[model samples]
Target: DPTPDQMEGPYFKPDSPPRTSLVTSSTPGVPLTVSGYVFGRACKPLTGVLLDFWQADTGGAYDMTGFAFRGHQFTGADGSFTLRTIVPGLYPGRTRHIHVKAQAPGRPVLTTQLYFPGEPRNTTDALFDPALLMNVRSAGPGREGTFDFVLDVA
Candidate 1:
């Protein structure tokens, strides 16, 4: 089965620096750790899958001037990638979300957004999809979420 597709929105920037962390000690908001794997249709791990991630800041403002919260990383031999980000703030017309683009070595890129489970705007956001919600849990002064992506290709 294919992971559901989502809008790329208007904030996508090409060629984000290759890294696993999206925030630093100075970055605001509660820390968030998102981890998961990229799997093939047959449930096999797909190494080297390129995964790009971006999101808004604690004030719901995007870094339009630079790549403040944008980065990409390739899945490891275990087909997993972990991102150290923060809980995004609310933005106009949308619920809290994290944008991602995953592409296996030879397959088309799957663009999707990860949503929090208890956002009130979730019901009002026309683009929100329950299928894309992450399993978020509190951890210390931050949060951790897991979301696995199963692509349609092998």
Candidate 2:
């Protein structure tokens, strides 16, 4: 059996968005769109970059049994990558967040997570700080909840 990590876990499974129907928009009655870009240490665009995303469900439980909310995709020539997923939910002691892993042909995997602004926990999150500020962009409410990530690749 494939472990959750191998399948990238739930929150964004390999073949998620369900084969049955299109995922509902994050916002009510509005089509949700999630987009971002990929860049290397050189500050140049990274083509063919592989990005994986995952998140807990609205109920705050992970789909540990199988791939559900996790999936991977590649970047385009312009370094832009996009996916459509319902917005994740907030759980106790935390606000909204999304896990991501970026990889290119020869680069090491860059594992990270994205968080929304104005959240009260940033000051208390174990890893939250000014250091890991690469993907900290404004998002949500009226936006696509973007999270552009850059990784070092030689």
Candidate 3:
């Protein structure tokens, strides 16, 4: 089992992206507004940052539990982050997504994925979808999901 600290991939902890409060918008599924501050990955407002996300609720809708698939992290000061986004609905050939910026100190914000477990679309998403497996389980119960991603500073 990889603890949040032990699990090392492209996630951020101390050294994240940049420093800024980014405003991300969703595709208007339920007439709502979402916003939050980027803490972990260190990024600034707008200025070419990438944020990716995904999630689901008990009703097969996007994690609408008030920014479920949403969270933000900044690398500027290396702080833990939070994203407040509307939960997403399951797309045709892809899982829900809260796509983001690869914005760090000197790098470009690249898009990433947050997939669900048992979704059949995992095998066919033209995107590099993580295969449907035990690891694809939901982030948890609340829509407020937390993931720490680290980007290569350009």
Candidate 4:
């Protein structure tokens, strides 16, 4: 089965720089590394898939003036990409989540949200889904996760 789709929230920005790292040593919050593979609907690894990712800061604020925690990267030959960011903070009406847009060559882009498991607000957040939870675990001073994206394409 293909990965389930999620709603594109209101904080998306277009044309984010092509990058793999979204945070620096000076960036506030717990360090986070999210890595995953992109696969086709037939379960074949899809190289060169464009993956755009964005998230709120530790204060739960979006950078409307500039691209802070936002970046785009294409999958490598192994259909893998790694994102070095931070654990996103919670806003008043939403649980902690990361927004993503995955687009493979000649296929429709899929917009979705990556959620953190075991958050109390998840149950109350209207858009939160259990199926979207990442497999997060402690790594050094922060956390890391793996979430594969399977596109709905032949």
Candidate 5:
């Protein structure tokens, strides 16, 4: 089965720098690390998959002038990826989530959002989908999140 698709939202920016991490210790908000692997429909791991991620900062504001938390990266040979960012702040009428676009070579793009569990707005946000929730665990003062993606392509 493939991961469910979600809206791209109005904040998507093309041509984001190819990077694996979006923030440093100096960055605001709770430290978060999202790591996962990409799998083909056949259940095989897929390398070289492009994953572009974008999200609001700790203040629940998107950087309209700069890349901010926006970045893109390809899966390693093991079909694994790691994104070092912070917990996105919640904005009005939306749940706490991270926006991403995934695409395997020669395959269609899958736009989606990763949600945090136990968020109060998770039940109220009309766009929130449980299928996209990541398994998150508190790691000391930081957080670690994991979510494997299954692409639609065979």
Candidate 6:
């Protein structure tokens, strides 16, 4: 089985700057690091997969005029990606989550969102799915999350 596809809100932009970290030293928020791998059929690790990420700032505000908290990057040779960002603040209509579009080298892009555990609105948000939940834990003053994506390609 592959990761579920969820329709994202209307904030996606094209040609995001290529980078891994979405924050600067002065970026204010609870630090977070999300690392994962991309896999295909027969449990094959997929290298060079494109993972574009976008999210709200610490105050639940989206960057409509600029590319804040938005970036795109390719997975390493081992199919690993580490996103350095902050825990997105809650928006009015959704639970805390991160938006991502994953694309295998020659496959269709999977538009989806990753969820945080124990969010109050998880039960209320219709798009929240248990299958997309990340294994998050506290470390020092920040959080670390892990999630492996299974793509529908061979």
lDDT of each: 0.91, 0.58, 0.39, 0.90, 0.92, 0.94
Expressed as tens digits, the lDDT of each residue in 1-154 for candidate 1 is 5679999998998889998999999988899999998898799988999999999998998887899999999999999889999889998999999999999998788899999998999989998888899999998898999999888776
- Residue 136 error for model 3, in Å? 8.4
Model 6 lDDT, residue 136, Cα: 97
Query: Candidate 6: where is the Cα deviation over 4 Å?
Result: none
**What lDDT would candidate 4 get against the real structure?**
0.90
Q: Which candidate, 3 or 5, would have the higher TM-score against the true structure? A: 5
After superposing candidate 2, which stretches have Cα over 4 Å from the reference?
A: 1-32, 130-143
Candidate 2 C-alpha lDDT tens digits along 111-131: 666666666777776545343
Quality of model 1 by C-alpha lDDT: 0.91
Best by TM-score: 6
Q: Look at candidate 4 and give me any clashing residue pairs.
A: none
Clash statistics: count for each candidate = 0, 7, 57, 0, 0, 0
What pairs collide in candidate 2?
A: 11-69, 11-70, 12-69, 12-70, 12-71, 13-69, 13-70
| TM-score result, candidate 5 | 0.97
Clashes of 4: 0
Per-residue CA lDDT of candidate 5, range 49-104, in tens? Answer: 99999999998989878899999999999989999999999877899999999999
lDDT head-to-head 5 vs 6, winner: 6
- Ten residues in sequence with the least summed lDDT for candidate 2: 1-10
RMSD of 2: 6.5
Error of 6 at 66 (Å): 0.9
Indicate the TM-score of model 6: 0.98
Q: Which parts of model 5 have CA positions greater than 4 angstroms off? A: none
Name the regions of candidate 1 deviating beyond 4 angstroms. Answer: none
Predicted model with the maximum lDDT? 6
Prediction 1 TM-score vs. true: 0.97
